[PDB]
Write a protein that binds this ligand. Structure first.
Ligand SMILES: *[C@@H]1O[C@H](CO)[C@@H](O[C@@H]2O[C@H](CO)[C@@H](O[C@@H]3O[C@H](CO)[C@@H](O)[C@H](O)[C@@H]3O)[C@H](O)[C@H]2NC(C)=O)[C@H](O)[C@H]1NC(C)=O
Ligand SMILES: *[C@@H]1O[C@H](CO)[C@@H](O[C@@H]2O[C@H](CO)[C@@H](O[C@@H]3O[C@H](CO)[C@@H](O)[C@H](O)[C@@H]3O)[C@H](O)[C@H]2NC(C)=O)[C@H](O)[C@H]1NC(C)=O
Ligand SMILES: *[C@@H]1O[C@H](CO)[C@@H](O[C@@H]2O[C@H](CO)[C@@H](O[C@@H]3O[C@H](CO)[C@@H](O)[C@H](O)[C@@H]3O)[C@H](O)[C@H]2NC(C)=O)[C@H](O)[C@H]1NC(C)=O
Ligand SMILES: *[C@@H]1O[C@H](CO)[C@@H](O[C@@H]2O[C@H](CO)[C@@H](O[C@@H]3O[C@H](CO)[C@@H](O)[C@H](O)[C@@H]3O)[C@H](O)[C@H]2NC(C)=O)[C@H](O)[C@H]1NC(C)=O
Ligand SMILES: *[C@@H]1O[C@H](CO)[C@@H](O[C@@H]2O[C@H](CO)[C@@H](O)[C@H](O)[C@H]2NC(C)=O)[C@H](O)[C@H]1NC(C)=O
Ligand SMILES: *[C@@H]1O[C@H](CO)[C@@H](O[C@@H]2O[C@H](CO)[C@@H](O)[C@H](O)[C@H]2NC(C)=O)[C@H](O)[C@H]1NC(C)=O
Ligand SMILES: *[C@@H]1O[C@H](CO)[C@@H](O[C@@H]2O[C@H](CO)[C@@H](O)[C@H](O)[C@H]2NC(C)=O)[C@H](O)[C@H]1NC(C)=O
Ligand SMILES: *[C@@H]1O[C@H](CO)[C@@H](O[C@@H]2O[C@H](CO)[C@@H](O)[C@H](O)[C@H]2NC(C)=O)[C@H](O)[C@H]1NC(C)=O
Ligand SMILES: [Zn+2]
Ligand SMILES: [Zn+2]
Lengths: 571, 571
């Protein structure tokens, strides 16, 4: 039967009859066209569904209406409206216009008869445009996919998908041109890069991965929200896809020089105040760096295999990146998260150089206190190193390594103190019970405030859970630095200007750094799709987000606070 | 057109014609029947394939002949013979016999005509039997699957699949009864437990996971061997599946008592030789166990998430178990690999008790050497602990943690020695270059023999890469123990019988343990399917394989060698 596009054909089919519709159209040698088939079925006899077969020249598609989805815990769903977009065949200049035939066979084995409505339309918005937002609606029975063609100048693009509602849970996938196109829930993650989303998604692609310099962007809606962060007629989802070009290679070399020349200006400070003085005229140390080298050896090998699993598969749900500001460089998918830790490592070498100069000049004056300062600058290096391997592929498992090492350092430091205790030990053991799981949480914060009071009093007599350590790192040291400002003012002592600049710089840097610490852009505490809802763009030279600025400012704030403790003893 | 089973129908189809065959049969209320459809296509015009649609009452299947597979690096394959087994509908006593209809629509859009051969048979060997080997042949275009029904007494089964040839690479999957059955390469790993095999495979199932107490065993042949350990008309594979019942709960409690009462008999030895004597009438220590606790904290959390990823998915290719002797217990998939390390931990507590008794009696005699012996017994505990967390889910990543810690211990021990060197340092750095990659390998073994000679000479003056450390652990200590046997014999010294029994027990235990060490049953150095080829059955009470016996004997051999070093100084 000859049939026309954009016309709703209705009919009744049963065991003896079988309706066959023939659709005839042509494809232009430059324009690319796609055909979408809509089938309805008002008959709710689930034992006798409507079987629809779509035949092309090189492909056959088949589905049953109403669609059935087997949910978890013995749940089933029906979908009376099923839609599908056929795989387009692109005509070139070498072939000219191409005539194409589509046969749509609608049949059923019902004894009485099943009603159905068939509508076949052409898609006028199949091809996506650069920097143009496109709005569309998808459904678990009605998947959608579109085509993007790479321009000649553009070498890498970012696909930004944004939705205003969290549910239903969706899947965005990028696939090749060659038919078939896997747009069903059981084969969408078979090949190509894919992501899971609730509100936001971001996929970064390169031109060299696709031989035709084009790809399909497949949008599949899941029938249940168990894979995302949730549970449980139609689950219609409104989406908005925008494809933007990535930054050029000049932004890479401009931001790399900013991350070096800022912290090399700190090296100019020591060589400038060392010129003022010209114008004014071990085994236990080596023991703490073999532990750090042998601790850091498996965690580099752990996250390298995490990165290569992501690269050779399409599973971008393993690493918890900030995908809106993840700029790749070769194997690394987020080079900006590694580059901002370079200044954190380097600045510790300046502090180790400063305490070396103080130790040699004290030993030279001895011819005519400095031990833990070496370990304080060593921990500045290794945490910047461990943050770099954490940011190769951030995950729930990798966070239990870069913080546990620092906890171990604190433990060994207490042993040295004891050489010249239980309330701090329950604190380490209460927080691992919260990993397992009203009575627990009222003492979870009660012992943390008591231990914060039990750190400040012992220093006074000597005169996530990592954020809770960082909570007391700001709170107790603010009073601990302020204890000798009022003690030296009351006694016969004066504050030199060189500590005075370092005290006021430590206060303003920790005020600025703690603001950027609370701007969480990702979280492994929930599902990977829930982590993507908090992603944000780059706010520094289109290369650094809020968390990468925190890596810069906490490097300065740790350095200036450590320089305060080296000073204030010149009287 | 009415058609009969077991008859090869041939025909020519083109654009105008479309052959439709109707197949009519009945299903018995106790016997379960399955229908297999074979389609050939001798026409090699790839632009106009033969499109076959199989319609049932509740399901529609469609495929094109010849089948096309898109390989890696732009490779394509054709398959002129395509076979498929339709999803069976089981008739019960409540429904009686059921009449069923199958329509097979064969069509093509070729202008001239395409030849095809259709054959539809019933399967007389669809249901599998317990403890009965079944032989069958599969192909990438001809997947096969069978049905197993759980007996009332059996609560858990093991599916043992064995093939005589490594290639082609195959996939074995276990799925639910409910249609559709995913037997294609793009959806076989969508749900249910699946495994990848080349020669052997073993899937362990429980009755409580399947609500119908039955399952489908799907066999899918991959078109390429890149997922397995290899590369690159038909790729026919001969397989053999046997379903065996698992061991009862009595074997669990019998083998658990064997692992305890053997090593508790070692505790009876100290309480027996302590009765003979009745008838004859710190801070640095605490520093080494906080490093071990903080090192062991993330690796338990690393492998627990590895186990839960395996459990909630079907991916059994992550953990490198010995699947022929992997006995689950709750969350753990291989409980026998955890249980054999219990005696390795416990036996170290006896050695720590022995050196405590020697230290107290020496201190009591002081009123009227023992430091590293505490650390030697501590490393006996922690390596048995670290082998247990390694065997929760063995992997390439987890091996770089349980060996690196021991390497770190050796490093810190050298610091104590230095307190009272470069050739040992290149050895640690050469072996990590072999992870990256003729000139390298001739010095890889040359520096290892030289360093083995450079360990023995320094002790003489005081009077995988983990297997290479274990290579010198046997070789250098054999001469190092033999150095004072000939020295005491030449000088005026006699060997007491209590060391003498311990020397001859150390030699026979290390001879027995090294035999079981070289029986490798798994290897993460290759693909997961290549690791499964070396799996073996349990050789000790149907609960312990060769590697679990190695955990028993090396625990005794380390204990008796450590007891030798405590003795031989009574003169
Ligand atoms: C496939 O064939 C078509 C048909 O010739 C090609 O389209 C043609 O492309 C050229 C190159 O850009 C166009 O010439 C340009 O025309 C504009 C005015 O439209 C003029 O301002 C430029 O200076 C230039 O001369 C040409 O107009 C265009 N033809 C049509 C009908 O639009 C197409 O490029 C071919 N594609 C491939 C991949 O070979
Ligand atoms: C299959 O059944 C569905 C659901 O009954 C049909 O979708 C419905 O289509 C009509 C006409 O396209 C929509 O009516 C229009 O709605 C808009 C927005 O409310 C309104 O501005 C218009 O004046 C008009 O009333 C209707 O909303 C829509 N229903 C839903 C739930 O989306 C569909 O057309 C049927 N046929 C096929 C081939 O899918
Ligand atoms: C579905 O209906 C069939 C038909 O009745 C049931 O098969 C029947 O099962 C009973 C129970 O085992 C059989 O009785 C046994 O017969 C053997 C001799 O064959 C005798 O030695 C035993 O002592 C016992 O009496 C009965 O023979 C068998 N009928 C036939 C025709 O084989 C079947 O159990 C029903 N299934 C369900 C799930 O209800
Ligand atoms: C589609 O084409 C294939 C391949 O041409 C056909 O398979 C062939 O089937 C014949 C008859 O079943 C087999 O011949 C028999 O071979 C055995 C073992 O060599 C021999 O003992 C017998 O005397 C007989 O000659 C033939 O081996 C087999 N070819 C292959 C490669 O397996 C198939 O029958 C065709 N039709 C369908 C519906 O699949
Ligand atoms: C449903 O099946 C019935 C028979 O099972 C068929 O009804 C026929 O409809 C055609 C025209 O639509 C006429 O020949 C008669 O009204 C019916 N013939 C017979 C022999 O029953 C038909 O296949 C289906 N009915 C529909 C679509 O209305
Ligand atoms: C699809 O429609 C086109 C018309 O748009 C048909 O093309 C016609 O074909 C006949 C015979 O081949 C010619 O005599 C006409 O001149 C063609 N029309 C045009 C506008 O070129 C085409 O045949 C149709 N497809 C099928 C399968 O019938
Ligand atoms: C291939 O297509 C041709 C037409 O394109 C058809 O050949 C017809 O075959 C039938 C019987 O097989 C007879 O009516 C004539 O021999 C042909 N008729 C016409 C109008 O050409 C047929 O569809 C196919 N040929 C086969 C299967 O042999
Ligand atoms: C499939 O075959 C069976 C026979 O094995 C057909 O059953 C017959 O149905 C007619 C009318 O319904 C009865 O008069 C006969 O007595 C039945 N035969 C038997 C042996 O019971 C059945 O109709 C066939 N299916 C179809 C769709 O025609
Ligand atoms: Zn960070
Ligand atoms: Zn082991």
């Amino acid at each position: 039967r000859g049939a026309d596009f954009d016309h709703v054909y209705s009919g009744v089919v049963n065991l003896s009859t079988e309706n066959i519709y023939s659709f005839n159209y042509t494809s232009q040698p430059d324009q690319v066209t796609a055909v979408r088939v809509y089938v309805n079925s008002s008959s709710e006899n689930l034992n006798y569904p409507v079987l629809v077969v779509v035949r092309q020249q090189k492909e056959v598609l088949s589905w049953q209406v109403p669609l059935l989805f087997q949910g978890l815990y013995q749940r089933s769903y029906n979908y009376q409206e099923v839609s599908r977009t056929l795989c387009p065949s692109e005509a070139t200049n070498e072939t000219g216009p191409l005539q194409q035939l589509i046969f749509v066979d609608v049949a059923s084995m019902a004894p009485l008869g099943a009603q159905y409505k068939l509508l076949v339309t052409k898609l006028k918005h199949f091809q996506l445009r650069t920097n143009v937002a496109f709005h569309f609606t998808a459904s678990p029975s009605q998947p959608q996919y579109f085509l993007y063609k790479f321009p000649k100048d553009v070498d890498s693009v970012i696909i930004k998908v944004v939705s205003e509602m969290a549910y239903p849970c969706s899947v965005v996938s990028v696939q090749n041109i060659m038919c078939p196109v896997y747009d069903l829930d059981h084969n969408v993650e078979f090949n190509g890069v894919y992501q899971s989303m609730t509100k936001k998604a971001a996929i970064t692609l390169q031109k060299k991965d696709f031989p035709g310099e084009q790809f399909f962007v497949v949008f599949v809606i899941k029938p249940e929200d168990y894979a995302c962060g949730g549970s449980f007629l139609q689950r219609k989802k409104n989406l908005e896809v925008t494809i933007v070009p990535s930054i050029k290679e000049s932004v890479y070399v401009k931001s790399s020089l900013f991350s070096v020349f800022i912290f090399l200006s700190f090296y100019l400070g020591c060589l400038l105040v060392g010129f003022v003085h010209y114008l004014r005229f071990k085994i236990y140390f080596w023991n703490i760096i073999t532990i750090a080298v042998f601790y850091a050896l498996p965690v580099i090998q752990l996250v390298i295999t995490y990165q290569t699993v992501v690269n050779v598969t399409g599973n971008q749900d393993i690493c918890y990146y900030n995908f809106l500001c993840a700029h790749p460089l070769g194997v690394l998918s987020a080079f900006n998260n590694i580059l901002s830790n370079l200044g954190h490592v380097l600045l510790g070498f300046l502090f180790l150089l400063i305490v070396l100069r103080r130790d040699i000049l004290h030993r030279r004056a001895l011819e005519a206190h400095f031990g833990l300062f070496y370990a304080m600058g060593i921990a500045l290096m290794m945490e910047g190193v461990l943050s770099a391997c954490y940011h190769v592929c951030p995950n729930y498992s990798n966070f239990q390594f870069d913080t546990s090492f620092m906890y171990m350092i604190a433990g060994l430091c207490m042993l040295k103190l004891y050489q010249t205790y239980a309330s701090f030990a329950v604190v380490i053991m209460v927080t691992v019970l919260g990993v397992v799981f009203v009575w627990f949480w009222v003492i979870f914060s009660a012992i943390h405030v008591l231990a914060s009071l039990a750190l400040s009093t012992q220093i006074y007599y000597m005169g996530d859970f990592a954020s809770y350590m960082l909570g007391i790192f700001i709170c107790n040291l603010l009073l601990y630095l302020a204890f000798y400002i009022i003690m030296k003012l009351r006694s016969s002592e004066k504050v030199l200007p060189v500590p005075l600049f370092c005290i006021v710089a430590t206060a303003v840097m920790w005020a600025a750094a703690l603001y950027f610490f609370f701007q969480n852009l990702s979280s492994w505490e929930g599902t990977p799709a829930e982590s993507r809802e908090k992603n944000r763009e780059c706010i520094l030279l289109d290369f650094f987000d809020d968390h990468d600025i925190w890596h810069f400012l906490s490097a300065t704030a740790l350095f200036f606070s450590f320089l305060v403790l080296l000073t204030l003893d010149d009287d």
